[PDB]
Amino acid sequence: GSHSMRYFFTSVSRPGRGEPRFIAVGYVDDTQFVRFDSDAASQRMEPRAPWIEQEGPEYWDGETRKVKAHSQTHRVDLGTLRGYYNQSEAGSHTVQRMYGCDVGSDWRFLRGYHQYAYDGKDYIALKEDLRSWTAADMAAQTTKHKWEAAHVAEQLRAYLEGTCVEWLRRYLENGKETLQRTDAPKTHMTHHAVSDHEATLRCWALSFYPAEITLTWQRDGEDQTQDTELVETRPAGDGTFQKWAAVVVPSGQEQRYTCHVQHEGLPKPLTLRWE
């Protein structure tokens, strides 16, 4: 089916306590594959996935080189922005940047992205047409003008539609076992006494990949959305994800409730029932 490639960059100023902290990570779908930490000893882009470990020095030196460059331009951005907002020198601020591409089930270019955020709010984004920019702040205007005049969109479009996509499918083939896999959820339920007239039924989904998953409860086949406690999908640490959905059942009513699980690793959706 569909796939994505995304690079995440975070730069945080450390007024007085040295250079700004810079952290970069790259993902293919929900699998991280590289990282760069400015505070680390190597000072190199490093592998975070088994399949990319075999790339070759040409690859690693090249990516370490381009990630260092990103580090530097963000270091300058922190200054630039401080000015744009007439902000103090003693303040710690944050710049974030994300860019990447999506390809459909046919593995052809489908969508590209390129966006910045300053101190947690949108700053500027490349529109889907990949030819125009979306600026919020009045400050963002200055940047928008700069990029239109220097023709930044054109350069990113070419990269997002070509280079980005070619490497995505290269990784897909090279990391096929990891990236083109699917781990169906291992499900189970728990029953715990809340009181003398109520019980909590928690429906579990574990060890699944990718992260996308639909986990709901129904009472006589009817939506229980507003009466369901759903936790955020979390990482297990080994590359798979976990999630649960709980409902409070009035004693003697377990038979009315069904848990439904939808995940692409399942040959067909599940309907679990405490019984």
Binding site: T73, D77, T80, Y123, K146, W147, Q155, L156
Partner: peptide, 8 residues
């Protein structure tokens, strides 16, 4: 990784 410099 994009290989060209970009400054806000």
């Amino acid at each position: 990784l994009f290989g060209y410099p970009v400054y806000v």
